[PDB]
mmCIF file of C-alpha atoms in Angstrom:
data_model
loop_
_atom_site.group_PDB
_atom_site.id
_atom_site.type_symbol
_atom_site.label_atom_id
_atom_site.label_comp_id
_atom_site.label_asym_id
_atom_site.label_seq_id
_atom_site.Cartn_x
_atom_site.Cartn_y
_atom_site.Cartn_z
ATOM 1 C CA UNK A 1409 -4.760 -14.187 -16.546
ATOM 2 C CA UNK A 1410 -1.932 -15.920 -14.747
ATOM 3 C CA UNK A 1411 1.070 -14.628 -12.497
ATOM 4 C CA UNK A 1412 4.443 -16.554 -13.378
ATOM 5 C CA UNK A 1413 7.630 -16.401 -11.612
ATOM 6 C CA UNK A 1414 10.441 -13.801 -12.251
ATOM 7 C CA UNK A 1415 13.293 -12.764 -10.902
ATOM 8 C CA UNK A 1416 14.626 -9.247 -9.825
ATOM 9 C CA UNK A 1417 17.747 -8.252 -11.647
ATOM 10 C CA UNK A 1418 17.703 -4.898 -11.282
ATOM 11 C CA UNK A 1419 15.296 -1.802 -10.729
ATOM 12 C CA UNK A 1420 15.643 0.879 -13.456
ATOM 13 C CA UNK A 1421 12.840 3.365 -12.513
ATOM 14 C CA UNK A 1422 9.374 4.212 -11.342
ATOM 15 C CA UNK A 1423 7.926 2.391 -14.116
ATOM 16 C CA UNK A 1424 10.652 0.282 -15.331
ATOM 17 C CA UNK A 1425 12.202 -2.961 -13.678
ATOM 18 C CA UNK A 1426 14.448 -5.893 -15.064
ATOM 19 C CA UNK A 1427 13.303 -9.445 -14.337
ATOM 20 C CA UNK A 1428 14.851 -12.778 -15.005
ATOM 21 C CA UNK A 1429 11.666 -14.419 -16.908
ATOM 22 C CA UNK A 1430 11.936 -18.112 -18.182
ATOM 23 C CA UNK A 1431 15.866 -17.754 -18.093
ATOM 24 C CA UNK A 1432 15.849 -14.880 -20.020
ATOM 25 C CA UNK A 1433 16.847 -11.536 -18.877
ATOM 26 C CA UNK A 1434 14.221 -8.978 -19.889
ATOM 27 C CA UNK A 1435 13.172 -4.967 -19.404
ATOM 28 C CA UNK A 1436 9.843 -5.101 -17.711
ATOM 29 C CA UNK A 1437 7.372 -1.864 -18.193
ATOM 30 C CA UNK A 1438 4.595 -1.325 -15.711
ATOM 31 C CA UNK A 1439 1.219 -1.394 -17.449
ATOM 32 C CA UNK A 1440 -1.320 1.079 -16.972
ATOM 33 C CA UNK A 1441 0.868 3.287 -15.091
ATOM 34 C CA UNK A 1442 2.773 6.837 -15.476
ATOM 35 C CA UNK A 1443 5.430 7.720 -12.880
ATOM 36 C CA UNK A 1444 7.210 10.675 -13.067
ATOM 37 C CA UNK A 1445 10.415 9.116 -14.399
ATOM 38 C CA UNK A 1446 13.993 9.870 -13.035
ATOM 39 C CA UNK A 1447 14.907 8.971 -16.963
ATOM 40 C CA UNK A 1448 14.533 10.539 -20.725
ATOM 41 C CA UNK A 1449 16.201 14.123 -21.455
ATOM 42 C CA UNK A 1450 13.666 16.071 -21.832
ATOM 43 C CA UNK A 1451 13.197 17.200 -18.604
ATOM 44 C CA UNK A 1452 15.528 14.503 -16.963
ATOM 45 C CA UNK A 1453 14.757 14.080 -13.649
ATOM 46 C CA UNK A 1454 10.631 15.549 -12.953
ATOM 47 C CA UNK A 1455 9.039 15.804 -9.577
ATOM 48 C CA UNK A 1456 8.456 12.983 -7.613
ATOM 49 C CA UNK A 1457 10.122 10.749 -10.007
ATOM 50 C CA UNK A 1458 13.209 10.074 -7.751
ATOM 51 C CA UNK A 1459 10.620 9.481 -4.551
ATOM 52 C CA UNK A 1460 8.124 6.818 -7.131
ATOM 53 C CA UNK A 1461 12.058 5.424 -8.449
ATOM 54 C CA UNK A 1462 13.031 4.743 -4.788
ATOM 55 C CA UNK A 1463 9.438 3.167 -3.676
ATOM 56 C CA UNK A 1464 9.568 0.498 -7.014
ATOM 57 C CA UNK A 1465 12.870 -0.094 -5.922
ATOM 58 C CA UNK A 1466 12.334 -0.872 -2.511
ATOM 59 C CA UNK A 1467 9.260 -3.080 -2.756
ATOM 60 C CA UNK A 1468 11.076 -4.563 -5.417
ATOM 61 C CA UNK A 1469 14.245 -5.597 -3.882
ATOM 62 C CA UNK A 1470 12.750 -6.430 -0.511
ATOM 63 C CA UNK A 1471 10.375 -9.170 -2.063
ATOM 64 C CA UNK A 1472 10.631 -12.872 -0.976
ATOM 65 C CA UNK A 1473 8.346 -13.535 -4.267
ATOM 66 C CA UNK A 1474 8.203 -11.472 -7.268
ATOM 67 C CA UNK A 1475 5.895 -12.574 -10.361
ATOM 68 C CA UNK A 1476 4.648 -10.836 -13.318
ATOM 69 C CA UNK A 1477 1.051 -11.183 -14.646
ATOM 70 C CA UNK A 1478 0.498 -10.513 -18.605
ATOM 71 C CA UNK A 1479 -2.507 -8.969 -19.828
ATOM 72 C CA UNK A 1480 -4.890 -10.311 -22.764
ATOM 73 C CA UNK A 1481 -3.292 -7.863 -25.166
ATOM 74 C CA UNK A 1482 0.349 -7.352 -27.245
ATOM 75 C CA UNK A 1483 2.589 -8.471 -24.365
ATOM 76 C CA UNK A 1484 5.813 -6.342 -25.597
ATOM 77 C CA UNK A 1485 5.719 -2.635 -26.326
ATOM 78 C CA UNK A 1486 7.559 -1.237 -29.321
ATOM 79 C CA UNK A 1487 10.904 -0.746 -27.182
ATOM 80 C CA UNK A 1488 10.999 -4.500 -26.757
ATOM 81 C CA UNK A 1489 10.014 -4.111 -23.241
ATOM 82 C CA UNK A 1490 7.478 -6.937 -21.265
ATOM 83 C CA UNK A 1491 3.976 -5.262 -20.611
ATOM 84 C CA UNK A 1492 2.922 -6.879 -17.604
ATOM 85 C CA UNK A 1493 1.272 -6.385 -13.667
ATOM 86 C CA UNK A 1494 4.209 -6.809 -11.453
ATOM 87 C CA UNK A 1495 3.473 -8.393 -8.012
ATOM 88 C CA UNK A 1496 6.140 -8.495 -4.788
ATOM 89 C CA UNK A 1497 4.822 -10.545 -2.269
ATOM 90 C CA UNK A 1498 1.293 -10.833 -3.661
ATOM 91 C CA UNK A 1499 0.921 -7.058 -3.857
ATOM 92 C CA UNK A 1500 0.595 -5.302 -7.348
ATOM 93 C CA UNK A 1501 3.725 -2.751 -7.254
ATOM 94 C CA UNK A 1502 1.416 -0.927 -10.050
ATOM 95 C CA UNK A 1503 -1.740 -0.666 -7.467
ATOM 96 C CA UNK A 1504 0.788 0.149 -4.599
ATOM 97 C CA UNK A 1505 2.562 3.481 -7.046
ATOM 98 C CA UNK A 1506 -1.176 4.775 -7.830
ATOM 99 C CA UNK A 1507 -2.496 4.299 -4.433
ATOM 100 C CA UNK A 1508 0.559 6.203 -3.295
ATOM 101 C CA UNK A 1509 -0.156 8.687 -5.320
ATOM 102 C CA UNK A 1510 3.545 8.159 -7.158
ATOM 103 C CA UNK A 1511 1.884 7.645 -10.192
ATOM 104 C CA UNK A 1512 -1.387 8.334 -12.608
ATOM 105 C CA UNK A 1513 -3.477 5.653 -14.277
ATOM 106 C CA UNK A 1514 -2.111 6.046 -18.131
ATOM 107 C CA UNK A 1515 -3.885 6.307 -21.119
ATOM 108 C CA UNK A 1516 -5.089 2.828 -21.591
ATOM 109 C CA UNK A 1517 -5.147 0.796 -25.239
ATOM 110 C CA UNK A 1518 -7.573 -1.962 -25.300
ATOM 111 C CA UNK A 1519 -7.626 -4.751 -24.454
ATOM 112 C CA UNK A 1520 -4.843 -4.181 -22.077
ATOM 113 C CA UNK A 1521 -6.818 -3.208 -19.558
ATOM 114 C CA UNK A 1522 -7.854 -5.834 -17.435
ATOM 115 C CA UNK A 1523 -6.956 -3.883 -13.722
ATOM 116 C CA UNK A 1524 -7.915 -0.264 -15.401
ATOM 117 C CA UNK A 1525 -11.049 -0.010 -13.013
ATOM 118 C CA UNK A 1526 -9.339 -1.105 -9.465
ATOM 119 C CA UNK A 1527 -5.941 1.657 -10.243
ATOM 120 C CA UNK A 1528 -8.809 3.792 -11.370
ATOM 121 C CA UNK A 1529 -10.271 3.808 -7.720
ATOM 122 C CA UNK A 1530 -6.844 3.732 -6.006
ATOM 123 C CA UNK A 1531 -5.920 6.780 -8.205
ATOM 124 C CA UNK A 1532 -9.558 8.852 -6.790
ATOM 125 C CA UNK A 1533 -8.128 7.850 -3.001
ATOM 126 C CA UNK A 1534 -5.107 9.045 -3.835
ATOM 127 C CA UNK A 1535 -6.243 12.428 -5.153
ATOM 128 C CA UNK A 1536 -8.888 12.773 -2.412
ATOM 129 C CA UNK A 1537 -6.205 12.150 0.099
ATOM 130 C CA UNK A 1538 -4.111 14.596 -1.865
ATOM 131 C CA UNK A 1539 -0.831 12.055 -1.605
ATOM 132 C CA UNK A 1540 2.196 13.385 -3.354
ATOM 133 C CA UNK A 1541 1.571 14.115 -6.651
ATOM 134 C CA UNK A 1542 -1.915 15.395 -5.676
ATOM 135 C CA UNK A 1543 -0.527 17.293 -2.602
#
């Protein structure tokens, strides 16, 4: 795999950020992960959703370098959004929302699934620390 530059346009979520990528403006989904989302009807806004929307955000917009790593798999999802490991500063913002215990490790679909084992042992930390959503 290989990271390649991006840059932020805007944050839209936990799990959701928009990226300038090769010129193109494009919806970016965070792979492997499930945030409690501040978005979709219904329930609307769900626990912890506006605290994992505020941490993407931050670590988002306070990035010198942002770039976006694809996995070996479909690289879109069906909504037309990238599938992709998002990194600000060198630091997975995927890793960073699991380890925080802002978000679980999703149900995975081979072969995306390259990182599945590391979030997998940042998500047990998490819940043995009881962080957040553990808490």
């Amino acid at each position: 795999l290989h990271k390649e530059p991006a840059t932020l346009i805007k944050a839209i979520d936990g799990d959701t950020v928009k990226l300038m990528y090769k010129g193109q403006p494009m919806t970016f989904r965070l792979l492997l992960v499930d945030t409690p989302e501040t978005k979709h009807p219904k329930k609307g806004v769900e626990k912890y959703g506006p605290e994992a929307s505020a941490f993407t955000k931050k670590m988002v917009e306070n990035a010198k370098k942002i770039e976006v790593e694809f996995d070996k798999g479909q690289r879109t999802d069906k909504y037309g959004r990238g599938l992709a490991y998002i990194y600000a500063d060198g630091k997975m913002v995927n890793e960073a929302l699991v380890r925080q215990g802002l978000a679980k490790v999703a149900y995975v679909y081979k072969p995306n699934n390259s990182h599945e084992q590391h979030l997998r042992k940042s998500e047990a930390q998490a819940k043995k620390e009881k962080l957040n959503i553990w808490s």
